[PDB]
Design a binder for this molecule. Structure first.
Ligand code: HEM
Ligand code: HEM
Ligand SMILES: *[C@@H]1O[C@H](CO)[C@@H](O[C@@H]2O[C@H](CO)[C@@H](O)[C@H](O)[C@H]2NC(C)=O)[C@H](O)[C@H]1NC(C)=O
Ligand SMILES: *[C@@H]1O[C@H](CO)[C@@H](O[C@@H]2O[C@H](CO)[C@@H](O)[C@H](O)[C@H]2NC(C)=O)[C@H](O)[C@H]1NC(C)=O
Ligand SMILES: *[C@@H]1O[C@H](CO)[C@@H](O)[C@H](O)[C@H]1NC(C)=O
Ligand SMILES: *[C@@H]1O[C@H](CO)[C@@H](O)[C@H](O)[C@H]1NC(C)=O
Ligand SMILES: *[C@@H]1O[C@H](CO)[C@@H](O)[C@H](O)[C@H]1NC(C)=O
Ligand SMILES: *[C@@H]1O[C@H](CO)[C@@H](O)[C@H](O)[C@H]1NC(C)=O
Ligand SMILES: *[C@@H]1O[C@H](CO)[C@@H](O)[C@H](O)[C@H]1NC(C)=O
Ligand SMILES: *[C@@H]1O[C@H](CO)[C@@H](O)[C@H](O)[C@H]1NC(C)=O
Ligand SMILES: *[C@@H]1O[C@H](CO)[C@@H](O)[C@H](O)[C@H]1NC(C)=O
Ligand SMILES: [Ca+2]
Ligand SMILES: [Ca+2]
Ligand SMILES: [Ca+2]
Ligand SMILES: [Ca+2]
Ligand SMILES: [Ca+2]
Ligand SMILES: [Ca+2]
Ligand SMILES: [Ca+2]
Ligand SMILES: [Ca+2]
Ligand SMILES: [Ca+2]
Ligand SMILES: [Ca+2]
Ligand SMILES: [Ca+2]
Ligand SMILES: [Ca+2]
Lengths: 143, 440, 270, 140, 664
């Protein structure tokens, strides 16, 4: 569905202050900590048992940076999300066999991370806008 | 043994067809289980037929007949022969003859590219030929690099490459290519990374196109706004009319359009209608670009046609080239207003003499004072009284540093807000009123 | 006769093959079933759209739970009106009509019901019955694969089939977790989930895997498929009964298929 | 399953939520209504606008229920038995809405308690909310 | 036996853990059924491990392995070994392995208690040693009984045993005890009922503590409100200054505090800020106070520290003795000089800073009804003591003078010769006997049952309706402006007798006619009434006892001037004052030009005006401000004819009282 111009402006303004080098790593670490079965796909990233080990893993931080770059790319093309995420969806579906629900889990974890870093600035309206954003990202990245 | 002759049967030529290996004096086929591009590349290098174009496992080449030698193979790509991977046993399988795997190699491939249903020979709905069959391309992942690669492969002026089929309708048949990923240096379109041939998750509505041009036939202007630099964005590409859709269209591309027309920056995405304009089937969709570019064609990945701007609206643009004294009747006279606690406040005229007037006039730089008016001479102020009894000696440069009763400590009302008339205050009525005296 | 089939005759009869998936494998958690490694798993949808699970056991029958067949039905409802209600999906989305559904005589103690299709399903790489075991693989430590069409970590019915590698747990630990002290006079409703399971001598339990992933609502009826490495055959060791152990209750209760094998054979022979 | 460390983290997090619980629950309900409009179909008699008094009262009730569950974290199926029967039979709330509300509560806690929403505490709170949702939807 | 050996497994040390007994060479456990401290004592004595600290039976030390030996052991305590009580068989049991019984013995636990990081040796965070390592105590279920047990266990004052660590931070290490349930008499904290050692979900922010004090170093006071008992509550407990968190702080706990300080009841959970107060990081947290407690220290489970009062404010309060008024020097009950107790000191009030709103609040608070008049200039006598320089900015509807906003002035306001006096309505003084004219007379000619009902408060003809609280509100019957006195009764007019006509009666007549406060007797229809004697307090003549109506050389009176000039060298110069509404008021100077002065001068009786002064030339006046912005035309006979914002509701102050200067 189309996103309203006010929601687009709020999303872009909130994403402008997002630390690209750290927010994605935070989201990926929180995903691997809260949902431990997501650590199955990152068995090559080293120690992933302790939550401190997951959050402090340099490979997890780098992959979170890449994930957040992909989110930024999908944000720049919010209206054409299937096209920009077609290759990533194919990669996750075939080479990695990542369940589509893991994308929604990572989206919700990212929403929680954004709320955590932005405090009261993450108002219910901008949260709804980002929920639409992450739902679109997960749908475009699935099947 | 090391004497296993391998042949391809019923696939047009020697390099394309269903795999068939001769072992133990009998010819046997190969299963399609866990069959990917690595196994196809191994097969192609076995026959010295080059790279692996694709693979087929649905027995499209034809039903086989014989002992299927291989069922499951774990090939990383670099093998001296097909009989080197983890073939999980020889002859053992769980297939039937309907699961036999084919392969199409580069040397025997008849791959070709063409453009159909376009304004010129360098634009339209791109199509590719696979297994002698012409099919279209889905537009997912189809970026400007893919457009440039296709333009170079076809061969015609490719200075400006634009995605999006020009006025082209949906194709027919198969979608042989999808999610093309080119870095812009591949000699052809099939050397790029993409999905398996035939396998896709699109429909014919999303048929990818291309617009190869040298940049001399791309024109843009604003129509319907009367002036040259206000109105909807009309697009002329290869003598074809068009209008810009507002999907992914902010102010950043609007100022790019304005700069291209040469009318400063962009003000708003709206205009006052002057005349009616026609509606064109094709549209210009702008994904995103930085906004500092000197022209609209010069920023990355702008789609020209190929989609319907029905859910969205036409893109409009209108370029840039389409302490204090209050209520005193002057500058150095009026109610003495002080600021405190984020609110403007007044000073009660209790024991307000000419010393306080001198202090407040010199603090404001208005020289000395002529009068110390009371009883709200310049109107009653609207703000809590801060100072009540001013005991300034007439020499200090600030009013708040005097012997007052403290901020908020008062027993007065706003009906007696203190006011002063400094010497520098001037009034005109010919008579001029300076230094508290009227004169010619 | 063709592949995925064997000839049962000393004119002849060609029947399906016991649990020999085309590509064998190796629900809150992951393990997306991308390769279709669980052909026996079937999706059962009730009248009010609660997806559940059922397991192919032969070419025409399916094992599920009586609690699954009684969804959107009265406690006194018989088996005649249950059959028209259920819609059954095998394979990708292949809808299969249900000729009749027969409940277990002790469906309050053995949560099993059988589903008989109108016609024998076409066995292929995505539809293939699992084989009822000849041994007891429910011995502690055995790891079985539990496919599932039930809910996921978001409590949304999973779009794609998933599976988990759940190891069977000590029985006494399971009753101690759900009931009180494995003795009738001290058992109390101590389930960490509100509802309590049907635990008896006919059911075993399989705990969460190493990633704290378990079976949630809608996973009931899904076979506890056990891979027998000796003969490379997949055996439905148990049918999941207590699916309400999403991640709170550490054990899912699976009714042993060996305990019900005599009854299912007597049924699969009217 | 809630480990003793997870129960400790949940108890600490809800204790430092403290008296702000009512408006935390109101904000969580508002975030659920805005982000997920499909959850508004269970409150047809509610004023769903921002700053509503009825939504604030229901959020206070929800937060009181969650506080009771935290205090009885070892006996949640009994502490939430009446709520379990309610949500499972009278309202017939689908469990996906419970997961949405759990996510919105987590977002509210993250927005209001950033210094204490550590990954371990976030995981523990998610486990506790999953336990509450499973208890409430068990009889569904 | 003599061949059976037993051990304790998985308990940290050899004197704690699961009970395991060897029989037929097999290690077996013991049920928790009918297991209590007697069995634990027997087992601990048998192992030479001392007494039994506690017993556990839910397999808290883990689930044992092997055959359960005993199920229902009946042990009275004095047994040589465990395998000597009656039980019900050797290996017969309706048990599981979740019912293994475990004991903790005295010499294994080696328990001790101490207080760490407090303001005194008997306050702060409570720390218990268990199995050689120190651990804190969770404050869940921690109340005054637990604190009393702990304080008496450490052997130091137990007069008041509060909870909560005084200022100690979170402890480090284990948290052993939780939900300690003491009755207040146990020898030590671990003989009480509590959760098993280490089994809880408490963080270290919930560390419990005590404050063992001998009821002598607890101090409470209010600071920052300009009086002894109005302001922010500031508790001083063992030299540690702290405040009270206002979570669950209403008028009940506020009343308890006020009674503790000795200032009657609590009126307001706030105060007028006079001075700032020192910031204190420790707080007092009250759970619930009944309201009848003689002191705040007698409330139930008041924590002294140990929590954070972040989203709650300091407890503010204003007791009903901040400004507690009283009327002294008045012969009748509800009149006299105003004296207001600023906390503990009685002092008078100057007449220049007591408006009719403040007097109405005074009369209402003192249960004296409405105000009749304000008498300035020390009418009821010169008050000895001090004069409060506070100007009461009363709105007029406040229940007490304590709630009135107050604007103190630095300079002295006046001498004791200008003490304000207030006369309220309820002058009845009835106890049936009634007191008027200084005589205690006895009142049934017109005494109905409604009069008896009103007399609720505990020949005059009371007319009570049975609802008003006081007999003063009852309309009582007991009976230009210069000439013969005429009274209207029974539809006919008649004169009033001059016999026994005191000055008080003439003043009452003049005030009732609304044209003076006093009067004089002058020489000259039938005569209706005679021998009229008015007491002090009634503003009307018909509340004065007299001879009965006898329809059958009379009271010619000349009321005083309604307008007078005060504080002047002569009688035709000074601050202008007028009489209206019962009290002598003043006239503000807003637009006070020479026409107003001319009108005033010709109303006083002397000649023309000279200069109309402004801004209290002769000083601030008494009573309220009646007239302001008077637009006299210069020809009005009296000041009452000129248009103005007449009779109250004037925004002027007493600093702007107008004045005139007339010819002598
Ligand atoms: C939800 C939004 C997600 C986005 C936008 C995203 C994006 C990406 C990107 C940019 C890559 C790098 C591709 C490459 O290096 O070639 C990648 C790979 C990968 N993704 Fe995701 N991802 C998402 C979610 C997930 C989730 C939820 C999981 C697992 C539960 C996952 C598992 C992986 C793995 C294992 C890789 C390969 C890592 C490697 O090869 O070292 N991703 N994804
Ligand atoms: C952690 C999750 C939840 C908790 C702790 C919770 C708790 C409560 C509580 C305490 C009540 C008040 C019952 C009463 O006053 O009798 C209630 C009622 C209700 N709940 Fe929930 N609830 C949860 C999830 C949900 C969700 C996700 C929905 C819908 C999307 C929902 C729908 C309702 C409705 C419709 C009512 C009835 C309110 C009314 O009739 O005014 N609940 N719940
Ligand atoms: C089976 O499901 C249907 C649909 O959910 C139930 O029908 C609803 O029943 C409730 C309660 O009686 C009504 O309020 C709804 O209006 C019904 N919806 C319809 C008829 O579309 C039905 O009751 C369920 N069967 C049971 C619970 O035995
Ligand atoms: C709590 O307060 C007490 C008393 O103020 C502190 O104990 C004092 O600590 C200082 C160190 O700065 C010593 O010099 C004093 O001798 C101590 N007094 C007593 C009576 O012991 C105590 O440190 C504080 N605890 C905290 C802040 O955690
Ligand atoms: C697109 O335009 C070209 C040139 O005008 C024309 O030849 C072609 O038929 C058009 N295609 C359509 C209308 O589909
Ligand atoms: C626009 O800005 C980008 C920075 O992202 C820069 O790379 C590019 O060269 C700029 N283009 C022009 C025309 O200045
Ligand atoms: C200012 O002062 C002069 C002389 O003192 C006087 O004539 C004049 O009227 C005054 N004006 C005001 C506005 O006070
Ligand atoms: C179940 O879903 C189907 C759509 O798949 C719908 O037609 C039907 O009405 C639904 N039934 C109920 C009871 O919601
Ligand atoms: C049901 O239980 C009875 C005894 O409780 C048993 O005899 C019978 O065989 C059981 N039913 C089946 C189908 O085994
Ligand atoms: C206070 O009142 C309560 C009941 O409200 C009573 O139990 C208690 O004894 C009373 N205390 C005093 C000191 O009057
Ligand atoms: C009133 O005026 C006369 C004459 O101007 C003067 O002598 C007298 O002092 C004045 N009164 C006062 C109180 O100053
Ligand atoms: Ca195959
Ligand atoms: Ca195979
Ligand atoms: Ca597309
Ligand atoms: Ca003044
Ligand atoms: Ca001055
Ligand atoms: Ca003043
Ligand atoms: Ca027991
Ligand atoms: Ca027993
Ligand atoms: Ca506590
Ligand atoms: Ca009467
Ligand atoms: Ca004035
Ligand atoms: Ca006037």
């Amino acid at each position: 569905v189309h996103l309203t111009p006010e929601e687009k402006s709020a999303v872009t303004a909130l994403w402008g202050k997002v630390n690209v080098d750290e927010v994605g790593g935070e989201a990926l670490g929180r995903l691997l900590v809260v949902y431990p079965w997501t650590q199955r796909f990152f068995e090559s990233f080293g120690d992933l048992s302790t939550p401190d080990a997951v959050m402090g893993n340099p490979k997890v931080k780098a992959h979170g940076k890449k994930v957040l770059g992909a989110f930024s790319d999908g944000l720049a093309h919010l209206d054409n999300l299937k096209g920009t995420f077609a290759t990533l969806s194919e990669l996750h579906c075939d080479k990695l066999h990542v369940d589509p629900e893991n994308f929604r889990l990572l989206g919700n974890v990212l929403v929680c991370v954004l709320a955590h870093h932005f405090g009261k600035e993450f108002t219910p309206p901008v949260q709804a806008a980002y929920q639409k954003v992450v739902a679109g990202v997960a749908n475009a990245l699935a099947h | 043994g090391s004497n296993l002759e391998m042949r391809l049967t019923r696939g047009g030529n020697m390099c394309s067809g269903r795999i068939e290996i001769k072992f133990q004096g009998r010819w046997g086929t190969v299963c399609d289980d866990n069959f990917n591009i690595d196994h196809a590349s191994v097969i192609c290098r076995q026959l010295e037929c080059g790279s692996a174009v694709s693979f087929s496992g649905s027995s499209n080449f034809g039903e086989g007949s014989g002992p299927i030698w291989f069922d499951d193979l774990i090939c990383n790509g670099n093998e001296s022969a097909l009989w080197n991977c983890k073939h999980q046993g020889w002859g053992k399988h769980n297939c039937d003859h309907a699961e036999d795997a084919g392969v199409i190699c580069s040397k025997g491939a008849d791959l070709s590219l063409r453009l159909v249903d376009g304004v010129t020979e360098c634009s339209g709905r791109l199509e590719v030929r696979f297994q002698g069959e012409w099919g279209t391309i889905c537009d997912d992942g189809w970026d400007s690099y893919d457009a440039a690669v296709a333009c170079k492969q076809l061969g015609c002026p490719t200075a400006v490459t634009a995605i999006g089929r020009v006025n082209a309708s949906k194709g027919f048949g198969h979608i042989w290519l999808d999610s093309v990923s080119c870095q812009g240096h591949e000699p052809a379109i099939w050397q790029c990374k993409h999905h398996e041939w035939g396998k896709h998750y699109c429909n014919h509505n999303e048929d990818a196109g291309v617009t190869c041009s040298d940049g001399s036939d791309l024109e843009l202007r604003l129509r319907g706004g009367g002036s040259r630099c206000a109105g909807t964005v009309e697009v002329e590409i290869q003598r074809l009319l068009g209008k810009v859709c507002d999907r992914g269209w902010g102010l950043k591309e609007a100022d790019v359009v304005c700069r291209q027309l040469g009318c400063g920056s962009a003000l708003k995405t709206s205009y006052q209608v002057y005349s009616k304009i026609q509606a064109t089937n094709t549209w210009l969709f702008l994904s995103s670009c930085n906004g500092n570019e000197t022209s609209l064609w010069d920023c990355k990945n702008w789609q020209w046609g190929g989609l319907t701007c029905d859910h969205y609206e036409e893109a409009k643009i209108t370029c840039s080239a389409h302490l204090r004294l209050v209520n005193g009747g002057g500058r150095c006279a009026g109610r003495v207003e002080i600021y405190h606690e984020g609110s403007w406040g007044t000073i009660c005229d209790d024991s307000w003499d000419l010393s306080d007037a001198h202090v407040v006039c010199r603090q404001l730089g208005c020289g000395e004072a002529i009068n110390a008016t009371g009883s709200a001479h310049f109107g009653e102020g609207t703000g809590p009284i801060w100072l009540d009894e001013m005991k300034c000696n007439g020499k200090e440069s600030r009013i708040w540093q005097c012997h007052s009763h403290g901020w908020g400590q008062q027993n007065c009302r706003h009906k007696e807000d203190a006011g002063v008339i400094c010497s520098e205050f001037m009034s005109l009525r010919l008579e001029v009123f300076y230094n508290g005296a009227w004169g010619t | 006769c063709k592949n995925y089939y064997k000839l049962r005759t000393e004119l002849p009869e060609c029947e399906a093959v016991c649990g020999k998936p085309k590509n064998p494998a190796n629900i809150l958690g992951g393990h997306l079933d991308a390769k279709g490694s669980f052909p026996w798993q079937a999706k059962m949808v009730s009248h009010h759209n609660l997806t559940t699970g059922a397991t192919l056991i032969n070419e025409q029958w399916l094992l599920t739970t009586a609690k699954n067949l009684f969804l959107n039905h009265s406690e006194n409802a018989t088996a005649k009106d249950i059959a028209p209600t259920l819609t059954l999906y095998v394979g990708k989305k292949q809808l299969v009509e249900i000729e009749k559904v027969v409940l277990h005589p002790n469906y309050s103690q053995v949560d099993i019901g059988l589903i008989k299709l109108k016609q024998k399903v076409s066995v292929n790489e995505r539809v293939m019955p699992i084989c009822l075991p000849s041994k007891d693989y429910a011995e502690v430590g055995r790891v079985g694969y539990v496919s599932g069409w039930g809910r996921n970590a978001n409590f949304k019915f999973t779009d794609h089939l998933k599976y988990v590698m759940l190891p069977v747990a000590d029985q006494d630990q399971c009753i101690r977790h759900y009931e009180g002290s494995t003795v009738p006079e001290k058992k109390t409703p101590k389930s960490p989930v509100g509802v309590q399971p049907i635990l008896n001598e006919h059911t075993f339990c399989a705990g969460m895997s190493k990633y704290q992933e378990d079976t949630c609502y809608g996973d009931a009826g899904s076979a506890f498929a056990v891979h027998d490495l000796e003969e490379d055959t997949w055996y439905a060791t148990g049918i999941l009964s207590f699916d309400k152990s999403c991640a709170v209750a550490e054990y899912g209760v699976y009714v042993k298929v060996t305990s019900i094998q005599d009854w299912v054979q007597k049924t699969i022979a009217e | 399953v809630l480990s003793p460390a997870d129960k400790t983290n949940v108890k600490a997090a809800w204790g430092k939520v403290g008296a702000h619980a009512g408006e935390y629950g109101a904000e969580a309900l508002e975030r659920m209504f805005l982000s997920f409009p499909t959850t508004k179909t269970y409150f047809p008699h509610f004023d769903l606008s921002h700053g509503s008094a009825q939504v604030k009262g229901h959020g206070k009730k929800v937060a009181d229920a969650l506080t009771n569950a935290v205090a009885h974290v070892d006996d949640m199926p009994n502490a939430l038995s009446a709520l379990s029967d309610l949500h499972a039979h009278k309202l017939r709330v689908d469990p996906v809405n419970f997961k949405l509300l759990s996510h919105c509560l987590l977002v509210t806690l993250a927005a209001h308690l950033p210094a204490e929403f550590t990954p371990a505490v976030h995981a523990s709170l998610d486990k506790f909310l999953a336990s509450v949702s499973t208890v409430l939807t068990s009889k569904y």
